[PDB]
Structures are given as C-alpha cells and as structure tokens.
C-alpha cells in the first residue's frame, strides 16, 4: 500500500508522478513494487485505487519521454490484469 513513501490516494498520484518524471530508468525492484501495490489494493478491495493507478500510470509513462517506463507499465499492467482475472474474475474497464 505504501509505495515510494506515498500512502494516501492523491499523495500516491503526486509523489509517483514526480518519481516517474525524475527517474529516467525504473529498476526491476521498482517495477515489482508497483505490481505489488496494484495487487495490494485488489486484496484491500479498493478498486477505486485500481481505476486511479492504471489510468494515471499510463498518463505518467507517456508524460515521461523514456520507452523503458512504457515496457515497465506493460509488465505491471499485464500482471495486475491477471490478478483481477483470478481474484474477481474480471478487470476494471480502465486501460
């Protein structure tokens, strides 16, 4: 739930935005953190958080000029989609 120090909803949007725009290269640990985050809120049943983090991540990875964030997002998105297909059976409409 607590990712990059950020705990609250809009606190996550702000700090993870500044994170993706400053960092030009996410390491595998950074990628796995955001997978675990977007899986945690599925286990905490906060699909409002899923809605936010998916659509807003995409925005940030496109706001970042680096294609490494696009492949990072592709892996994170993929894994978290699968988690929703097992846990709920369906995914949130957002991509």
């Amino acid at each position: 739930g607590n990712l990059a120090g950020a705990v609250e909803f809009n606190d996550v949007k702000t700090l993870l935005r500044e994170w993706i725009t400053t960092i030009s290269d996410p390491m595998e640990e950074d990628i796995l953190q955001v997978v675990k985050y977007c899986t945690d809120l599925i286990e905490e049943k906060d699909l409002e958080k899923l809605d936010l983090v998916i659509k807003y991540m995409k925005r940030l990875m496109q706001q970042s000029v680096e294609s490494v964030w696009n492949m990072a997002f592709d892996f994170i998105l993929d894994n978290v989609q699968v988690v929703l297909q097992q846990t709920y059976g369906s995914t949130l409409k957002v991509t």
Side-chain angles (χ1 to χ4, degrees):
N2 52 270
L3 219 292
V7 182
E8 292 178 273
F9 307 99
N10 290 265
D11 188 53
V12 164
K13 296 196 308 181
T14 302
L15 280 298
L16 282 294
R17 174 168 179 183
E18 302 181 280
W19 181 66
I20 296 180
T21 58
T22 56
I23 305 295
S24 310
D25 164 51
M27 306 193 67
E28 183 178 87
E29 291 190 36
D30 297 293
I31 302 175
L32 297 180
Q33 274 170 89
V34 185
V35 178
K36 282 295 178 297
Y37 174 61
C38 304
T39 299
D40 280 320
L41 52 82
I42 293 175
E43 300 297 280
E44 299 175 278
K45 300 180 303 179
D46 205 286
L47 299 179
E48 312 308 292
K49 263 280 77 174
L50 197 287
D51 175 268
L52 293 171
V53 70
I54 292 296
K55 68 182 60 176
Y56 197 71
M57 259 190 304
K58 183 187 61 182
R59 294 170 56 176
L60 302 181
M61 308 297 188
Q62 303 305 270
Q63 184 178 90
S64 188
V65 301
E66 299 298 295
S67 53
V68 57
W69 286 104
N70 303 149
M71 293 185 62
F73 177 67
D74 184 67
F75 185 71
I76 299 167
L77 188 74
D78 177 77
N79 290 211
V80 174
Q81 292 286 322
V82 179
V83 177
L84 274 172
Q85 303 169 332
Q86 314 308 327
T87 307
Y88 286 80
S90 311
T91 59
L92 218 296
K93 59 180 296 183
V94 298
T95 15

